[PDB]
Every structure is written in C-alpha cells, then in structure tokens.
Symmetry: C2
Amino acid sequence: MDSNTVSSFQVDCFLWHVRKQVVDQELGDAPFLDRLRRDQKSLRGRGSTLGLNIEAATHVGKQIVEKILKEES
Amino acid sequence: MDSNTVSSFQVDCFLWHVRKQVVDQELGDAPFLDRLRRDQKSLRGRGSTLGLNIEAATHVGKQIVEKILKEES
C-alpha cells in the first residue's frame, strides 16, 4: 500500500471537512453539494477499505496544511 | 447568476491551490492528480466564463477559510 495514497486521502478528508463548512455557510450552488455527497460515499468506501478514522484523518490534514502554510503563509 | 456560485467557486479555487501544494509535496497517488488536472481545465472554463482571477479567488478563499476557522479553530 503506497503511503502517498494515505496522505492524498488525509488531504481529501480535511478538504471534505472545509467543504462541509462552506455548505453549512449556506453558500452551496448545487454541483459543489452534489460533489460533496458523492465524495462522502467515496470517503466512506475508503474509510471502510483503509479502516482509518476520518475524524483523526482530518486532524492530520489540518497539520499537513499548517506545514504547507508554514513554508509560505 | 447566483452569488453562492461565486463563493463555491472561490472555495474550489483555494482548494485547488492547497491540492497543488499536496502534489508539489510529492504525495500524489494518481487519482488526486488526475482530478486536479480535470479540475484545472474546469477552473479555466469558469475562470474564463466568470472572468474571475484564480489568484484573487484563492486569496478571498484563504479569508473564507480563516472566517470559518475563526468560528471554530
């Protein structure tokens, strides 16, 4: 199992979160929400396959972003 | 033209940026990169149609994220 896949997953996880926040802000058009839904189903498939916690994954992503932001605010 | 579409776009823009950073980190599996490419082409279509600067959109997004983070670190 490639690690890059795990990292890419953690990213998609954090992203999905931020997205859900964008929708909760009542700023969803229709395609973004639809994609978020289809993304959730896919996230659940990977979450089950990988059997990795999405909540903890989102946390790791947060740090992954802060690490990339630390290199360039 | 709904504003929610503009906001959703700004978000996708910022997201595309963070994503590009994830790939630049040499953590791309294959599907994430492919999606990034197809996302770029679509981003260019919206960038041309909307005629909005991607760099400017990414900026506004950064604030959109900080605004959502300010509501909950």
